[PDB]
Design a protein around this ligand. Sequence first.
Ligand SMILES: Nc1ncnc2c1ncn2[C@@H]1O[C@H](CSCC[C@H](N)C(=O)O)[C@@H](O)[C@H]1O
Length: 327
Amino acid sequence: MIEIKDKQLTGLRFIDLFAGLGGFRLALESCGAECVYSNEWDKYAQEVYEMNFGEKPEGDITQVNEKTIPDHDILCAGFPCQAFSISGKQKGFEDSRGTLFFDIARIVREKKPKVVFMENVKNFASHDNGNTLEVVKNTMNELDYSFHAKVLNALDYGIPQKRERIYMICFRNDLNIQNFQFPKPFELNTFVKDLLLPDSEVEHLVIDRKDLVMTNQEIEQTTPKTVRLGIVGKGGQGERIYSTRGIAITLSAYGGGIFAKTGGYLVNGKTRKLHPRECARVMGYPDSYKVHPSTSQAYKQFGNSVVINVLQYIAYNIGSSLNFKPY
DNA sequence: GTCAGCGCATGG
DNA sequence: CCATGGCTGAC
Ligand SMILES: Nc1ncnc2c1ncn2[C@@H]1O[C@H](CSCC[C@H](N)C(=O)O)[C@@H](O)[C@H]1O
């Protein structure tokens, strides 16, 4: 993560829905806001959260009466993406994992917060011939909010990962906010090779396979794109090998392949997958964040999360717009 | 609960 | 043509 000296959000409160690791929390707290409620039902997510923040998130959102919730100013929520991802069955709202959005709607109507800030995958904006996005747009307008959405590739903001996501911000109609804007991009100056650990700590992650085919030569100069050097088996998800001089591919939570959830990389002549910590780093997490003791669960948790750095820049821009109230 | 081989939509 | 991003069955 980046460091914010001008704390544009001091004195405001928010809630953490579908918390996971608490990615939304680090982002907002670094700016000066305060967390007053949280909610996440996965047994293990509940453990890491407690370990790093010191409180236990409430359970199942579908059975929590909306009137218990504390008063707040910003509702943070990165709802489930398996029903909308380009790697799935694309069942949208017909999937019981796809109807969460409406519980958000339910909560919003009662507490009328100043800002709603959500996140989801690139394909959300194109699913069902574009109908799905309209539905979120119209429901938000009807509840008296404005709607702002855009797709941002992580490599345009300092993190070497090809992760494209749609971000959605909604201000309450009576505040009259007319100058919010999405941060401007910049040149990358960090690559996969600048975050790896020493060879003595990753020795157990190596893999020697004899169905290894080489389709390209290792490059000699840095670039901001994924460079495939080889393949194993048939070359499907988790069977592709890239270079440490380019950038990482999207980390996932239920992935397959011999190089599951992270991908394979050629390091100093040997091929291997990434360490939980090297995963924490390509997601922009700080070396002080204690990860879960069970390696397996740790991989899944990272593949489900958000990048910290992008959430930060957008967070700042939000506060700036709320703070401009001239005579 | 963990592992690994898959199979096809979408965007050039 | 060419490359990327969860589901399902096995123990
Ligand atoms: N019905 C429900 N009630 C509560 N939490 C739920 C839920 N359905 C799914 N979840 C949890 O929703 C999360 C969505 S992914 C979000 C990750 C989070 N943004 C990050 O910063 O790490 C998963 O952890 C899932 O276990």
